[PDB]
DNA sequence: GGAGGCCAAGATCTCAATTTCGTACAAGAAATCCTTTG
DNA sequence: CCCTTCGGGAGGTGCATCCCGGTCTCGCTTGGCCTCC
RNA sequence: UUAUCGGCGAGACCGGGAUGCACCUCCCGAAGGGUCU
């Protein structure tokens, strides 16, 4: 039982993006900014912890296996709690006295929930955020525009029949129409939208009850429409992503981490490393990156860390570097006494 | 540009050039030692003093020119007894906040819609002394033709003029803070304003 | 059951454009810049994206075929869904009770919408951007001036009618006056967005109002013939552009699918637009490389390469792909 | 044997419930502007 | 020494947790009992 | 300022879990041409 510190650097061999509740507004997608609005942005930590535990979760099955269907032992149950470390059976407590020590057995035992932690036990491992080393490594990426496919290539019109082309007359008729006058009810409500800003707190409330009402009628006018419920002709708006090349310093650390607990870790590490996607934005093939980590050991009350080695992620292939790592692995592959089931 | 004072952004008096300001942290004491050359300087003003304790109101200057104990070789307020009469009207505690959201730098309606109220309800010539020329504009837009001249101070244009012109046809005479020791007179001496209108304290916004 | 990622490079045989619109801005178009004003520009990789969208949605049709009168027995829901990804008839929903598990079933009988997906249903393609690999390979192309005709070549003077010659001569000194118009009201514009606030947006508004009517007030030449053609930024001619794509998970069915459609863009290889100007053309290739997850290194299952001789494909895991997506039957793109 | 210290015991009872500064300003000059233009 | 284009259009939805566990005191005087001198 | 004088103090980790993601080609047109060992 030793700390792991995985200090390193993600390079983003594509965008990265994320969309964070909190961090998007009705401005559009954006990136949380590691501080206020104009602070450089950072990619969540929450992002990476969930992938790598959907990894280490996906290398749990594997070496568990599947029967000849191809189907895990697993219960859903248990995939939950070990992914996402939700209890859906509806039963796990924090104070539990009789689970005090009921955890270090729960951990030698299910060394991915002692890893990733659930709702009552820690998690050993704990996934910083990716922050950019210099500036203007982020920006607007992925906007776009839904066209017409029929309006873009005339060669798709001889597809269709006689019957078919009237009823795209009358999409893109009834597009034009409820367009026009959404338009209209959308200059009409940020005309009355820009009085909220000089409004009195009384009237506050009344002009967003007449925004809402407005938004209905938006809503009733998309509904009234048969053809099309969305516009096919549309502006995609781009979200904010890191830029491809961008370094973003990383830090992980693995408390007390058991030789099997960093095994499983690191074949976790592997396993994202076919798949090395972060994020969002899978389209566009966002998330793609090349990331390189040093572990470093500190054995309580040295005054020096211990690099044990290097981990590097590149698309053409795995680097483990030093003796420590290739054991902590070997051992995590050789450990048969886990029981995910717990 | 760190190390002390103000950023900012200019554009050259001629040739109307694009610049970037900055401020010299330690020529503030330069004056200091320029004015201490002179056998001996008096700095007198009419509102040097912040409050009405010599020795409590004056730290502006002591500091600004960075003047420690070497240089304080007096301080005193003096003020005439008697001299005019002043009314005073106030906005109570209950009178409508000045900005809804003064980060967006936005002002409230109802203070608005007070403030032209009362304004309508003058009765001679006035000066109305605002503090923003934004603040000028929304006054001048919801305020209409009350009986009285009005008069603007547009956005950099030389007091001079707007002076000039109200002091022939007095009335209303809405000035931004540009006017900051020049008062109309009525071109003979004579007072041309039994109102002076502070609409809202010329309050500085947060310097972040 | 892989993970194919499509590594590789994209030769560029004319300049390569696209028109982004949170990319371009008034003061003229500009590629869609990797982050900020001063970065390196990149194609996106929505419009390859959607051009092989496309591509694969002309291949499903191809395969099922037309009728003898040559139409394509799907309808208009169903080549939206297909190729644009949009639900005319409104029936997609994201995270739906009772789609669950009908994912497989419905990429297995329709491996173009499991390529691409729809709304609600994750796309397995992934069509990451074009990265120049050097520096520079990028600038403004097109450029130009309509002119008038007329004044150039003196020949069509013998085509034209007198009738047709007096509107020709009206039309020009209609467009001069028009000329000397627009340029004194746009140094007016010019001169009060110098000035500087909504009041102000809302005089610009009319005067740009004012501006339209004026060219309103226009018998028969509205638009200005000759007039400047603003340039649209692009990639050089060979310019080399790192690309990146991947299909997660996909079936043998689906990355055949995906390779046809391949084929077929190499068939046109365009990219953008100005196709006016044949801006678009490309000449690609890229290893594709598996990696089977908990293996250290990927195996590279294979090469392609589009070029304007020919479309190469080395590896015989791809022909196996093409073959597999070719010969399998029980694809239902009716759905 | 006395004279310091440590501990226990001694009557019942007093009244009351809390919440977030300030908003926008800019004059007559050595200047460097400058240096022209050439 | 020309002359700077049109506008299209701007999302649909999800879901918003559980639980601990809230302290001693003491505002004085006196004698009984313990060891100390 | 109806007197004089009097630190209220000492101890505590609040922590434990979560991928926000899922779909969109922004394209549509133009000769910048002509004058001088």
Redesign the pocket.
Known sequence: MRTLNFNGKISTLEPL?????NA?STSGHRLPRNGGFNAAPYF?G??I???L??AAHKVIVDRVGLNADGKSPFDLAEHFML????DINGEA???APGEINAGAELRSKNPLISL????????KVGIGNAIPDGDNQWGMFGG????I?FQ??ESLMEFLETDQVDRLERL?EE??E??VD??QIKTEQDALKKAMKSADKDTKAELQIKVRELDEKI?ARKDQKQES???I?????PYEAFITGAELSHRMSIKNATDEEAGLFISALIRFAAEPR??????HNCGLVEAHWTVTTWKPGELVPVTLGEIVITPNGVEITGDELFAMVKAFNENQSFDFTA | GLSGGQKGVGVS???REPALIAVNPFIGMNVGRYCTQWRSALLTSATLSITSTPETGMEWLCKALGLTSDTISIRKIFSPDVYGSMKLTIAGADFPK??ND??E?IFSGQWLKAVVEQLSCIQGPALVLT?????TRMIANQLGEVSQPVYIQK?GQALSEIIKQYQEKPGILIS???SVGVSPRGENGEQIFQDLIIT?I?????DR
Do not use: C
């Open positions: 993006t994320v969309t964070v509740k998007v969540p929450t992002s912890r969930g992938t535990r959907h992914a996402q470390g939700v407590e924090t104070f990733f932690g659930r709702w009552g036990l820690s998690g776009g525009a839904r066209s496919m873009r290539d893109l597009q034009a409820a367009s959404i338009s809503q419920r969305e516009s002709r549309r502006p995609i708006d972060f994020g969002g934005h899978a389209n | 008096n001629k040739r000045v900005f003064p980060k730098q503090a923003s020329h934004y603040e956005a931004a803070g540009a809202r010329p309050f500085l916004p947060p």
